[PDB]
Design a protein around this motif. Sequence first.
Motif, PDB file in Angstrom:
ATOM      1  N   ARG A  51       0.835  -1.217   0.000  1.00 54.08           N
ATOM      2  CA  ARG A  51       0.000   0.000   0.000  1.00 54.08           C
ATOM      3  C   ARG A  51       0.868   1.265   0.000  1.00 54.08           C
ATOM      4  O   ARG A  51       0.604   2.199  -0.748  1.00 54.08           O
ATOM      5  CB  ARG A  51      -0.934   0.015   1.244  1.00 54.08           C
ATOM      6  N   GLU A  52       1.929   1.243   0.822  1.00 57.51           N
ATOM      7  CA  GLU A  52       2.822   2.399   1.033  1.00 57.51           C
ATOM      8  C   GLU A  52       3.584   2.765  -0.261  1.00 57.51           C
ATOM      9  O   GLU A  52       3.852   3.943  -0.527  1.00 57.51           O
ATOM     10  CB  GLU A  52       3.824   2.100   2.192  1.00 57.51           C
ATOM     11  N   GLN A  53       3.902   1.734  -1.064  1.00 57.32           N
ATOM     12  CA  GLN A  53       4.679   1.862  -2.313  1.00 57.32           C
ATOM     13  C   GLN A  53       3.755   2.150  -3.515  1.00 57.32           C
ATOM     14  O   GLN A  53       4.238   2.506  -4.599  1.00 57.32           O
ATOM     15  CB  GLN A  53       5.502   0.571  -2.580  1.00 57.32           C
ATOM     16  N   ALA A  54       2.434   1.951  -3.321  1.00 56.38           N
ATOM     17  CA  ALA A  54       1.416   2.308  -4.325  1.00 56.38           C
ATOM     18  C   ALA A  54       1.360   3.832  -4.487  1.00 56.38           C
ATOM     19  O   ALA A  54       1.499   4.560  -3.502  1.00 56.38           O
ATOM     20  CB  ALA A  54       0.041   1.750  -3.931  1.00 56.38           C
ATOM     21  N   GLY A  55       1.163   4.304  -5.730  1.00 50.15           N
ATOM     22  CA  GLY A  55       1.292   5.729  -6.047  1.00 50.15           C
ATOM     23  C   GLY A  55       2.747   6.189  -6.064  1.00 50.15           C
ATOM     24  O   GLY A  55       3.020   7.393  -5.989  1.00 50.15           O
ATOM     25  N   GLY A  56       3.677   5.216  -6.180  1.00 49.82           N
ATOM     26  CA  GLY A  56       5.113   5.478  -6.184  1.00 49.82           C
ATOM     27  C   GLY A  56       5.857   4.525  -7.110  1.00 49.82           C
ATOM     28  O   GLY A  56       6.045   4.830  -8.288  1.00 49.82           O
ATOM     29  N   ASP A  57       6.248   3.340  -6.590  1.00 49.36           N
ATOM     30  CA  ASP A  57       7.083   2.362  -7.339  1.00 49.36           C
ATOM     31  C   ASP A  57       6.304   1.076  -7.686  1.00 49.36           C
ATOM     32  O   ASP A  57       5.352   0.686  -6.996  1.00 49.36           O
ATOM     33  CB  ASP A  57       8.367   2.002  -6.524  1.00 49.36           C
ATOM     34  N   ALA A  58       6.755   0.435  -8.773  1.00 44.72           N
ATOM     35  CA  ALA A  58       6.327  -0.905  -9.210  1.00 44.72           C
ATOM     36  C   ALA A  58       7.464  -1.588  -9.967  1.00 44.72           C
ATOM     37  O   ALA A  58       7.347  -2.770 -10.304  1.00 44.72           O
ATOM     38  CB  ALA A  58       5.091  -0.848 -10.106  1.00 44.72           C
ATOM     39  N   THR A  59       8.566  -0.833 -10.223  1.00 48.98           N
ATOM     40  CA  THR A  59       9.703  -1.304 -11.022  1.00 48.98           C
ATOM     41  C   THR A  59      10.319  -2.524 -10.334  1.00 48.98           C
ATOM     42  O   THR A  59      10.589  -3.554 -10.955  1.00 48.98           O
ATOM     43  CB  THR A  59      10.796  -0.171 -11.202  1.00 48.98           C
ATOM     44  N   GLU A  60      10.471  -2.386  -9.016  1.00 50.52           N
ATOM     45  CA  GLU A  60      10.966  -3.447  -8.137  1.00 50.52           C
ATOM     46  C   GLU A  60       9.815  -3.971  -7.251  1.00 50.52           C
ATOM     47  O   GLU A  60       9.732  -5.171  -6.995  1.00 50.52           O
ATOM     48  CB  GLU A  60      12.140  -2.896  -7.285  1.00 50.52           C
ATOM     49  N   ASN A  61       8.898  -3.052  -6.856  1.00 55.09           N
ATOM     50  CA  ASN A  61       7.839  -3.318  -5.858  1.00 55.09           C
ATOM     51  C   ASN A  61       6.884  -4.439  -6.291  1.00 55.09           C
ATOM     52  O   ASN A  61       6.632  -5.351  -5.507  1.00 55.09           O
ATOM     53  CB  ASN A  61       7.017  -2.044  -5.562  1.00 55.09           C
ATOM     54  N   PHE A  62       6.378  -4.365  -7.544  1.00 52.69           N
ATOM     55  CA  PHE A  62       5.341  -5.294  -8.051  1.00 52.69           C
ATOM     56  C   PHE A  62       5.839  -6.756  -7.944  1.00 52.69           C
ATOM     57  O   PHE A  62       5.065  -7.664  -7.644  1.00 52.69           O
ATOM     58  CB  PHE A  62       4.953  -4.931  -9.522  1.00 52.69           C
ATOM     59  N   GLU A  63       7.159  -6.941  -8.144  1.00 49.34           N
ATOM     60  CA  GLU A  63       7.822  -8.261  -8.099  1.00 49.34           C
ATOM     61  C   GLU A  63       8.292  -8.594  -6.660  1.00 49.34           C
ATOM     62  O   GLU A  63       8.391  -9.769  -6.284  1.00 49.34           O
ATOM     63  CB  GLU A  63       9.022  -8.273  -9.088  1.00 49.34           C
ATOM     64  N   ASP A  64       8.553  -7.537  -5.861  1.00 46.69           N
ATOM     65  CA  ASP A  64       9.087  -7.647  -4.483  1.00 46.69           C
ATOM     66  C   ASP A  64       8.027  -8.228  -3.541  1.00 46.69           C
ATOM     67  O   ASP A  64       8.224  -9.288  -2.925  1.00 46.69           O
ATOM     68  CB  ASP A  64       9.543  -6.241  -3.994  1.00 46.69           C
ATOM     69  N   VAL A  65       6.899  -7.515  -3.450  1.00 48.85           N
ATOM     70  CA  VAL A  65       5.741  -7.938  -2.637  1.00 48.85           C
ATOM     71  C   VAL A  65       4.948  -9.032  -3.368  1.00 48.85           C
ATOM     72  O   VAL A  65       4.176  -9.777  -2.748  1.00 48.85           O
ATOM     73  CB  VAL A  65       4.797  -6.729  -2.313  1.00 48.85           C
ATOM     74  N   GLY A  66       5.154  -9.097  -4.697  1.00 57.36           N
ATOM     75  CA  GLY A  66       4.513 -10.075  -5.548  1.00 57.36           C
ATOM     76  C   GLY A  66       5.056 -11.483  -5.382  1.00 57.36           C
ATOM     77  O   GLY A  66       6.039 -11.700  -4.662  1.00 57.36           O
ATOM     78  N   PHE A  67       4.397 -12.449  -6.037  1.00 55.70           N
ATOM     79  CA  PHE A  67       4.878 -13.832  -6.097  1.00 55.70           C
ATOM     80  C   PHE A  67       6.172 -13.894  -6.939  1.00 55.70           C
ATOM     81  O   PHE A  67       6.326 -13.119  -7.889  1.00 55.70           O
ATOM     82  CB  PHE A  67       3.801 -14.751  -6.709  1.00 55.70           C
ATOM     83  N   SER A  68       7.061 -14.839  -6.601  1.00 55.05           N
ATOM     84  CA  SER A  68       8.421 -14.934  -7.175  1.00 55.05           C
ATOM     85  C   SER A  68       8.406 -15.055  -8.719  1.00 55.05           C
ATOM     86  O   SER A  68       9.181 -14.381  -9.407  1.00 55.05           O
ATOM     87  CB  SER A  68       9.155 -16.127  -6.527  1.00 55.05           C
ATOM     88  N   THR A  69       7.524 -15.922  -9.246  1.00 55.99           N
ATOM     89  CA  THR A  69       7.336 -16.101 -10.698  1.00 55.99           C
ATOM     90  C   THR A  69       6.120 -15.297 -11.213  1.00 55.99           C
ATOM     91  O   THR A  69       6.232 -14.561 -12.206  1.00 55.99           O
ATOM     92  CB  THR A  69       7.164 -17.616 -11.072  1.00 55.99           C
ATOM     93  N   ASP A  70       4.962 -15.428 -10.514  1.00 58.65           N
ATOM     94  CA  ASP A  70       3.654 -14.914 -11.006  1.00 58.65           C
ATOM     95  C   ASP A  70       3.691 -13.402 -11.253  1.00 58.65           C
ATOM     96  O   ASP A  70       3.287 -12.962 -12.314  1.00 58.65           O
ATOM     97  CB  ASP A  70       2.486 -15.255 -10.041  1.00 58.65           C
ATOM     98  N   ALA A  71       4.231 -12.634 -10.282  1.00 59.42           N
ATOM     99  CA  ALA A  71       4.282 -11.153 -10.351  1.00 59.42           C
ATOM    100  C   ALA A  71       5.015 -10.646 -11.605  1.00 59.42           C
ATOM    101  O   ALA A  71       4.680  -9.581 -12.140  1.00 59.42           O
ATOM    102  CB  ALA A  71       4.956 -10.590  -9.105  1.00 59.42           C
ATOM    103  N   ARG A  72       5.995 -11.439 -12.071  1.00 55.75           N
ATOM    104  CA  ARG A  72       6.830 -11.091 -13.227  1.00 55.75           C
ATOM    105  C   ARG A  72       5.990 -11.023 -14.522  1.00 55.75           C
ATOM    106  O   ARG A  72       6.184 -10.121 -15.337  1.00 55.75           O
ATOM    107  CB  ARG A  72       8.005 -12.088 -13.364  1.00 55.75           C
ATOM    108  N   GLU A  73       5.037 -11.970 -14.698  1.00 56.85           N
ATOM    109  CA  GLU A  73       4.106 -11.945 -15.857  1.00 56.85           C
ATOM    110  C   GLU A  73       2.820 -11.168 -15.522  1.00 56.85           C
ATOM    111  O   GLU A  73       2.180 -10.604 -16.415  1.00 56.85           O
ATOM    112  CB  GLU A  73       3.758 -13.376 -16.358  1.00 56.85           C
ATOM    113  N   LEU A  74       2.468 -11.109 -14.225  1.00 54.03           N
ATOM    114  CA  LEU A  74       1.227 -10.449 -13.761  1.00 54.03           C
ATOM    115  C   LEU A  74       1.344  -8.919 -13.856  1.00 54.03           C
ATOM    116  O   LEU A  74       0.328  -8.231 -13.809  1.00 54.03           O
ATOM    117  CB  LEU A  74       0.791 -10.926 -12.327  1.00 54.03           C
ATOM    118  N   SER A  75       2.581  -8.401 -14.017  1.00 54.02           N
ATOM    119  CA  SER A  75       2.836  -6.971 -14.274  1.00 54.02           C
ATOM    120  C   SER A  75       1.999  -6.492 -15.476  1.00 54.02           C
ATOM    121  O   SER A  75       1.074  -5.699 -15.309  1.00 54.02           O
ATOM    122  CB  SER A  75       4.350  -6.735 -14.501  1.00 54.02           C
TER     123      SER A  75
END
Length: 98
Positions: A51-75
């Motif tokens: 939530r804190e990184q929303a309205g800011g980053d996703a370059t690293e964040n989406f994959e960081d808080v995301g699933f190890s494989t899933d977040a990479r394609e879920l972007s």
Amino acid sequence: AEQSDKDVKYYTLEEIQKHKDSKSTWVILHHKVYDLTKFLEEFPGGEEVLREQAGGDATENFEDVGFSTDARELSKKYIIGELHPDDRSKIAKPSETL
């Protein structure tokens, strides 16, 4: 900014800056915006970690808080539109003093 063309919506980072609720939680890779509103429900109670990184980053964040494989394609899966070209420059980094 509401886009008159109803395909690929120009979200502003000024809009997402007030990320209070899960439905107001979107993230930006650099210039394009991706839906986090749904993506956080994939994590049972994992809205608060990103939530804190929303309205800011996703370059690293989406994959960081995301699933190890899933977040990479879920972007690109959560393509809710593009972030406004002016706004990614406005709030590339806000006043970190708050």
